[PDB]
Symmetry: C4
């Protein structure tokens, strides 16, 4: 109808309730489920769906061997009905590639997929299911994007890309698209030293992205975008409650404008909702691997370098595998505020479970509740032994 505008503030987050879960690996043990990774969730005005990068093979298929690799010509961004598994028969291909983002602007959806060799990748921006714009690699080193939904405001949908090193300074750009066409792009500015896989959400005409400093930071970089002025700023979450992985143990004081050191050249896509006292951080429980997942209420995490948790909720036990996590909200729901939501990628197989030759995942997602709900843990649920 009309372009959606971020007119509401976030609802108060007092706990998280179960939103969706596809049990993909369990089901796929005996049904035609596509091998995936890098999933996320995104809503249209009339439906919310699961998204992920298929590996172009089923889990039981012989071609599942080798799916630990991230980039091949057989990957594609696919979407499917909320909480269903990504099957060969119900998956809809949005575009071809090994890195992506997607978001609905209120009128129609924009999907972006990047493909190519490491030194010659290119992004193609789709709008209303048609290719509209193409952007060639600018640093010739794995042009890559969010791996979770972008956000729009009055037709303008900003997207964060990075091209260049994963272990040193790189060239990050914020592109402002409208109807799949480039209105403008800026180089990253601010104090964030390295940006990758931004998880974003919007509220009151502002877009907040919590990203991954793969190079040096165990605290997460944050990019705040003004989609009207088409400008942005960057910093890190000040809080000592560190949320990347692997990471050192939490200190008593964090860092607001530099990566918190201790772990180099590695990380995991993650997210947060930064909203004063209504601030919640997601992170793996393990400081060593993508194991477990929890949400922590850390009032003023973004700006308070001594902020510590005041409440929490375990999502996945540290005795279960987790993975990527990102933000999304249903901007078309009823009510006076936007309900914060997130998903956690539950990776199965390689490298942690090497008895199988494949790597895939399933999805679990939650949304906030103003109630103080009882908690449960939500593991993938599949038995590797069954696949042997």
């Amino acid at each position: 109808r009309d372009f959606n505008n971020l007119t509401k503030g976030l609802c108060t987050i007092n706990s998280w309730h179960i939103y969706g879960k596809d049990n993909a690996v369990r089901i796929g043990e005996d049904s035609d489920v596509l091998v995936t990774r890098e999933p996320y969730v995104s809503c249209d005005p009339d439906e919310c769906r699961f998204y992920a990068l298929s590996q172009g093979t089923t889990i039981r298929g012989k071609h599942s061997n080798g799916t630990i690799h991230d980039r091949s010509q057989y990957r594609a961004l696919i979407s499917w009905p909320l909480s269903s598994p990504p099957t060969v028969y119900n998956s809809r291909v949005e575009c071809i590639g090994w890195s992506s983002t997607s978001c609905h602007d209120g009128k129609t959806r924009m999907s972006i997929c990047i493909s190519g060799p490491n030194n010659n990748a290119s992004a193609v921006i789709w709008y209303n299911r048609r290719p509209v714009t193409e952007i060639n690699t600018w640093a010739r080193n794995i042009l890559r994007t969010q791996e979770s939904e972008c956000v729009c405001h009055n037709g303008v949908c900003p997207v964060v890309f990075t091209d260049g090193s994963a272990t040193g300074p790189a060239e990050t750009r914020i592109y402002y698209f409208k109807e799949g066409k480039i209105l403008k792009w800026e180089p990253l500015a601010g104090t964030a030293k390295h940006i990758e896989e931004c998880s974003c959400y919007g509220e009151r005409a502002e877009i907040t992205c919590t990203c991954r400093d793969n190079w040096q930071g165990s605290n997460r970089p944050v990019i705040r975008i003004d989609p009207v002025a088409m400008t942005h700023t960057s910093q890190y979450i000040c809080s000592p409650v560190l949320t990347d992985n692997p990471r050192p143990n939490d200190p008593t004081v964090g860092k607001c404008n530099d990566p918190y050191p201790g772990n180099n050249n590695n990380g995991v896509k993650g997210f947060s909702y930064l909203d004063g006292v209504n601030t919640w951080l997601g992170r793996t429980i393990s400081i060593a691997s993508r194991s477990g997942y929890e949400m922590l209420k850390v009032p003023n995490a973004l700006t308070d370098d001594k902020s510590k948790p005041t409440q929490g909720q375990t999502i996945v036990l540290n005795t279960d595998w987790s993975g990527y996590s990102g933000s999304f909200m249903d901007y078309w729901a009823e009510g006076e505020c936007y309900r914060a939501c997130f998903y956690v990628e539950l990776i199965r197989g390689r490298p942690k479970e090497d008895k199988v030759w494949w790597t895939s995942n399933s999805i679990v997602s939650m949304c906030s509740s103003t109630e103080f709900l009882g908690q449960w843990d939500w593991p993938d649920g599949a038995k590797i032994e069954y696949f042997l």
Copy 2:
């Protein structure tokens, strides 16, 4: 369009004709059919569909092992086209959880799923396929609901929940929802001593629920709800024709305001249509197990403590497995009256058939006819031996 109002009375029930049957277990022996239990049927203004709690695995899948358990993180309320089996590819997830109800109010559908550990479960109320309200456990002992459709009148959709003991007094509540929001809730009142899994239907602005007294009663408790005043009453079906299972043999006089004793701490979800002389009761044939199924015309069963059958119809032979049964009607059909319908869950596998490691079911359903139709029996139809 507009909210549906229960303006009609029930059609005269002279017999039951076949409405739907999915042959899920038969078909699933060699196709991707999800393991389920606790099924039901519910209509939208333009379509009637099958519903059930998936176990998040196919029947032939290795994860079918252990599906005798009722509550896990892999269950979800799913719906699928009338008389099709619940397959991985045609099942639509309504919400995540291990106990549910769902009903269309004329404008859109409300679905409710409860999930959690036994001592910390929570219900999330979905409306128009979005989460709207959440209710935390109040007795910290398996918050649970109907396992069959709720009923609406002018936007108000009452739902019966129970939290606490399955073998002693518990805390039952009647919630009155409108557009997924709570208008009001009451504690159970009346003479029903224990309430579980209410089967409901509506006629002439009144909602009647036939439930399960798991603690002491072999006769069934009944809750009558006024969805306008948002009040209710409770009692038991007076009739000596006992309809829970297991149960003692039928006496000559029943009980109107106390559980009829003889069997404790067990039962099965069931239903009835209480409409004066146009009264029909469903029950398993066996007094020992979920075996067989029959419909009995017992004029004035609700209020006559000596009422006995005047007509009947066998649905499932006592040489075949049955299970849960509940009520539903198509409130959007043509005509001057509501046609009473019901489904019977035909459980296969554990515990009665232990040669297989799984537990699932198929569905059979009937609706009333004003004709006096010839009868047939409707078994699940699968051969366990084939799954060995």
Copy 3:
């Protein structure tokens, strides 16, 4: 929109072109295809679909054993997209039963399914996907119907049923339905001595049905219905070109008002288009079994007891299995005339191919062309050996 009226005459039939073919048995050798029999084709104003009586099991499934039997509680009328195979995932259940008919009246579709034991069957008439009317068996001996589409005119959709003996006089009735309700019914009248499985079509406000005299006739009985007056007549196709199976060899003179003798208590559903010189008859090539299939132009077959063929077209070689055949037309196509169409059921498995334990079929269908098209033969195409 408005009820369709049979306002056009048939197009001139100069040959038959290929319309649809699903290759169900071939495909089903390695995919989830339902075992069926008694298929047909029927059109809605916006789509034409395949129909058949499922056996409630896939062909490769272990439950395919025994599917040679005609009536069980696991059968159902299902429809699916034109030329697709009837799979577990794309088949839509119209109703439950082991005998059926279905037709669209221009506004919505009426489907009828009969189920029950042999001595207590009942038909339930569905309209707009809801059960509306039920008819109990009147002769307590396998109440049965067309097994192909019915035809409507101004809302009135006549349907031919038979109850009683398959090897002696039976009770055939013509029911005139409108919106699923019975307007009127008549007993069969005229000279047809036994009626079963009528294949019907309509043109210029008249409905013509070519049926099966199972008891004595090798020539086919014909019922002509006036859907406005709601009256009918019956006779046999006069022509010596005999079209039932098994049958004696063709004589030089046929019979107009009595069954042509030679073969008792057996037959096969078949059809014809009786339109003066524009008359075509379908029949199996073999006089012994459901083998081969051909179309023969026999000018004035209905009324000329010496009529012989003037043109022909082989549909299935006598070295391939055939089966049932029936009529349908797309009453919603463009143009000034109705294009005659028909389907042939290609039965595979039992009894003719006993190396497999199942019985199923695939479908081939053609429609007329005013051109004189070259011919091809259209076999099922599956190799039984593959299923062993």
Copy 4:
């Protein structure tokens, strides 16, 4: 709505970006994927889909044995969602046959399928999913058509057919259809000596077809059609950059009005976009077999007999199998010009990979970009060894 008119010119082709890829063979190793060949892509005003000639069997199915053959009664034109594989459950049958074309005129789609024995084939023209016209073979020698989309302008959709010899002069005809009816047909005229499998596109009220001279030419014949005057001309691409396969090595001077000799009685469906300096040619890399695939910018190829490449893009490495290739464009996209697109059929199995008994393919397709994008190669990706 209204018939589409070719009002735009082509966009400037500076490179090719990835548009769709289904990875059919990879996926089909362990899922119900239909065996196909002769694929293409075609757009409706609201969706773009993949098309191909199914072989009426899955790849893993036993009936895949023998699918190297081109014409059988089990083939059919099917379409399915962009970039999905052609599965038993998501494929839509357009018509029955072993040679086809299809195109949307802006209001609805016309599909054409030819079937029959070699000496008695016939084409049936479908419009709005109904059969409308039939054309009998005129030379009694494999009546055949494009194997890629036709193009329409103001309701008129020209289609090129050929009947007669594949190794000598044949009878090619250009039929001008409107709403599935024949407005007119012409015999081929011009200097093209043999025409087969035309790949066409339209721009500025002109339709250009690049075909296959199977008899003598290694350069490609070209047919330019005026869909308003309903007339055409034919010649060959003048350029020495030869694009059929097998072929001799490129000379320094080509031929404008005669086949370029060196290879007889063989070829492959191919295409080009002839637009002055904005001219691009597709061809296999190998001059011996359907191996590899590349796009070459050859300014004025059509009219310059000495034209050589000025730019290029590899699509498939010469170490990978290719196959047919053809043109299509989304005539309903936004913007001021038509974006040239094409697909390449990646054939797997027989005859080149004889360890398996089947022959199938997958699809890759690209569209032009005004950017100068980095390139990647796009192989089928399946491991034959897995199918053994």
